[PDB]
């Protein structure tokens, strides 16, 4: 029912197995399959596979933050049909495959920040497309985000793409995102941007902005100074984006 | 001389140029060369080169924490002779070269944690052979032991949260002042008893006769776990009785 290092709190017909900061080397196999909240954060589990979370139908909240997971097997979360939140932050993941995130069909929160993700498959989020309300891919090495998947989530209200290496933002990626309230693009490799609407919150500070005529539409907006800086042309290098007059954006 | 976004505090002939959280894309070139404390943390500077810190003789404290440094040029800190502390944590450094950490001759503290360091040159630290060396939270499989073993003043070595699988027999031999050694969350399966505070939790310990010496020590339970043999897998290292650490001769040359 409860693994030796773990503590189980039985709420009104609801199981919560807490194994946080207990020095685990791998997910314990003696966890009850009736558990709803599985907390495995601050451990040292390096590998996830199919038998770790097999037959767990009613698992709602699974947190695996600040671990040492370098590899996630094909269909590790395959039986997690009720999974509404999945935390995989502060890990060593480099590539996310199509089979890795298969399973949580009603997933609403996906935290994948603080890893070393360089490539994510285009069909990785295909099983949790409609449901996904929050997508966090902060602090990774991402050059290209899977825009086809991220653009097919009608319920997404938060997308954290900050602290990555994204050099291009296409024009069809912002289309069809009605509930999008937050889009963080801080600390990336973006030099140019294309006129995008729905300006209610977009952050783009710490980007190598090319302050010329192509970036004059953005300079005309009523937005706060988030300390955005010009990296090129050399005359504008070092100067704040919101402090340089509109007449100095020449070609 | 003070750069437009930076604030300079002159406290009794002590220049403190603070540029933290200013959204800088690169180290400003209008910084006074007489500065002693240069704070450039929480900035978005991605590249360091030799003209960024040239002619700064009296620079003692240089902090570049939580930035986006992916590359450090050859002899970037070349003229920082007085540099006693260098913070380069929370960055994107993957490989440290021999010429990269050249310059600070009297360096006493070196923080290189939170990066993605996979390889470090053997002669990178050859200029300051240091009191504190931090290489935590990186992807290090092998650290420069020949360099780390040639620092007679080293009192702290943080190797935790890396991928170190082996610890050589004669490295800490020349380390007399070593008081702290963090080895938490690594790939270490076996340890050798070579003394003269050590943490080793979160390692894939092979709990047999080879680690029985460690089990006999009067140490607190830092939640160390056995990964092998299969009978001891999952159980705590400090909870398994000493009689259960059995083995067969290793038969090696
Ligand atoms: C200001 O700093 C300079 C050295 O850069 C020093 O000569 C001067 O005395 C300092 N001013 C005060 C009031 O301490």
Residue numbers in the entry:
A (entry chain A): 16 to 215, 228 to 278
B (entry chain D): 16 to 144, 147 to 213, 228 to 284
Lines quoted from the article behind this entry:
SALMs are considered to be postsynaptic adhesion proteins, mostly expressed in the neurons and regulate neurite outgrowth and branching. SALM3 interacts with all three known members of LAR-RPTPs (LAR, PTPσ and PTPδ) to induce presynaptic differentiation. In this study, we have solved the crystal structure of mouse SALM3 LRR domain and show that it forms a dimer that is close to identical to that of SALM5, and the residues that are involved in dimerization and their interactions are largely conserved, and our complementary biophysical studies support this.
Four molecules, or two dimers, were present in the asymmetric unit of the crystal, one monomer had an N-glycan partly visible in electron density at Asn25 at the N-terminal end of the domain. Both the LRRNT and LRRCT subdomains of SALM3 are stabilized by two disulphide bridges; in the LRRNT between Cys17-Cys27 and Cys21-Cys34, and in the LRRCT between Cys238–Cys257 and Cys240-Cys278. A flexible loop (residues 216–227) is present between the 7th LRR and the LRRCT, not visible in the SALM3 crystal structure. The hydrophobic interactions and hydrogen bonding networks are conserved at the interface with Gln131 and Arg107 forming hydrogen bonds across the dimer interface to Asn156 of the other monomer and vice versa. Comparison of the SALM3, SALM5 as well as SALM2 dimers reveals highly similar structures with r.m.s.d. values of 0.691 and 0.758 Å for the LRR domains of SALM5 and SALM2 against SALM3 structure, respectively.
